[PDB]
Design an enzyme around this catalytic site. Structure first.
Site: not given
Ligand SMILES: *C(=O)N1C[C@H](NOS(=O)(=O)O)CC[C@H]1C(N)=O
Length: 261
Positions: A43, A46, A210
Site C-alpha cells: 500500500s 499509493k 502490508s
Molecule cells: C496495503 O498494503 N494494503 C491495503 C490495506 N492497507 O492497510 S495498511 O496500510 O494499514 O496495511 C490492507 C492491507 C494491504 C493489502 N491490501 O494487502
C-alpha cells in the site's frame, strides 16, 4: 552511535529482511540498511499514485472534482470508504484521500485507472526522477510480495528520495505538495509503525503497507521538535508466505534512527 550494528541485530532477531533509508534534511546525511535491495511496496505505492493524479490536476484544473462511478463489481479485498459509495460516485480528491488515509484498495484502483493503468504510475515516477520504482499490477495482486519478484517493488533509497522530492521538494506544485502533506499527516493507520518509535512531540505524515510474506511497510516524513525534517522508509518482509505482520520491527528501526540523531 553504532547504528549499523543495531539495525543488523534488529533484523537478525526478527528473522526477516529489513530495509531502511533515512534522509536527514538538516545536513543531507543518510542512514541506509539494504538501501539498494528491492522490496514489495504494497500500500505504500499509493503515495506515487496519488501524487501522479495531483500532478495531472496542475493542468486539468478541475480534475480532482470529477466524479468516478463506484460499482459493486469494483470492490476488492479492503474497501472501507468505497463500499459506502457503491452504486454512486466519488471524486478523484475523495478517492485520493481514501487511498492515502484509510488505505482503500478500490480507491487505489480508481487512481491507477485514471493514470491509464499501472504503467501510468511508473511513468510519473520516471518524470520526477525515480528510475527504480515500478508498478505492474492493480489491487489486490500487487501485494503478493513473492521473494525475488521485481513486480511492484522499489528500493528504500529510491523511495526516500522520491518522498523527499514529493513532500519537501518541487516534484509537485506548491498547492499540490501541501495537499499531499495534509493527506499524509491525516493518515489513520500509522500509530503502530514508524510513529511508535519516535517521541510523541514530533509530527509525522506516513503511509503504511502490508502484504503476503508478512510484509510490513511504512514511509514517513517527520518534523522533529526544533529541527529540520527527516524522511524515513522502513520496509520489512519475511520467509514464510503466511507470516504475521511485524509493525514493532518498523517502530524499533525508527527508534534506533531517532537515538542516533
Ligand atoms: C496495503 O498494503 N494494503 C491495503 C490495506 N492497507 O492497510 S495498511 O496500510 O494499514 O496495511 C490492507 C492491507 C494491504 C493489502 N491490501 O494487502
Amino acid at each position: 552511535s553504532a547504528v549499523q550494528q543495531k539495525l543488523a541485530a534488529l533484523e537478525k532477531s526478527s528473522g526477516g529482511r529489513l530495509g531502511v533509508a533515512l534522509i536527514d534534511t538538516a545536513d543531507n546525511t543518510q542512514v541506509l540498511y539494504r538501501g539498494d535491495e528491492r522490496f514489495p511496496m504494497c500500500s505504500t505505492s499509493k503515495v506515487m499514485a496519488a501524487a501522479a493524479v495531483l500532478k495531472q490536476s496542475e493542468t486539468q484544473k478541475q480534475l480532482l472534482n470529477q466524479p468516478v462511478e463506484i460499482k459493486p463489481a469494483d470492490l476488492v479485498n479492503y474497501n472501507p470508504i468505497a463500499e459506502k459509495h457503491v452504486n454512486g460516485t466519488m471524486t478523484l480528491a475523495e478517492l485520493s484521500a481514501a487511498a492515502l488515509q484509510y488505505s482503500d484498495n478500490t480507491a487505489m484502483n480508481k487512481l491507477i485507472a485514471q493514470l491509464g493503468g499501472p504503467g501510468g504510475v511508473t511513468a510519473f515516477a520516471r518524470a520526477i526522477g525515480d528510475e527504480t520504482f515500478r508498478l505492474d499490477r492493480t489491487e489486490p495482486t500487487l501485494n503478493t510480495a513473492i521473494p525475488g519478484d521485481p513486480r511492484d517493488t522499489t528500493t528504500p533509497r529510491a523511495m526516500a528520495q522520491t518522498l523527499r522530492q514529493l513532500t519537501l521538494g518541487h516534484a509537485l506544485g506548491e498547492t499540490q505538495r501541501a495537499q499531499l502533506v495534509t493527506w499524509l499527516k491525516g493518515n489513520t493507520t500509522g500509530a503502530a509503525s514508524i510513529r511508535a518509535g519516535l517521541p510523541t512531540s514530533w509530527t509525522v505524515g506516513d503511509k503504511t503497507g502490508s502484504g503476503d510474506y508478512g510484509t510490513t511497510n511504512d514511509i514517513a516524513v517527520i518534523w522533529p521538535q526544533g529541527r529540520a525534517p527527516l524522511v524515513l522508509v522502513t520496509y520489512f518482509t519475511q520467509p514464510q508466505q503466511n507470516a504475521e505482520s511485524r509493525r514493532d520491527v518498523l517502530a524499533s528501526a525508527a527508534r534506533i534512527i531517532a537515538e542516533g540523531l
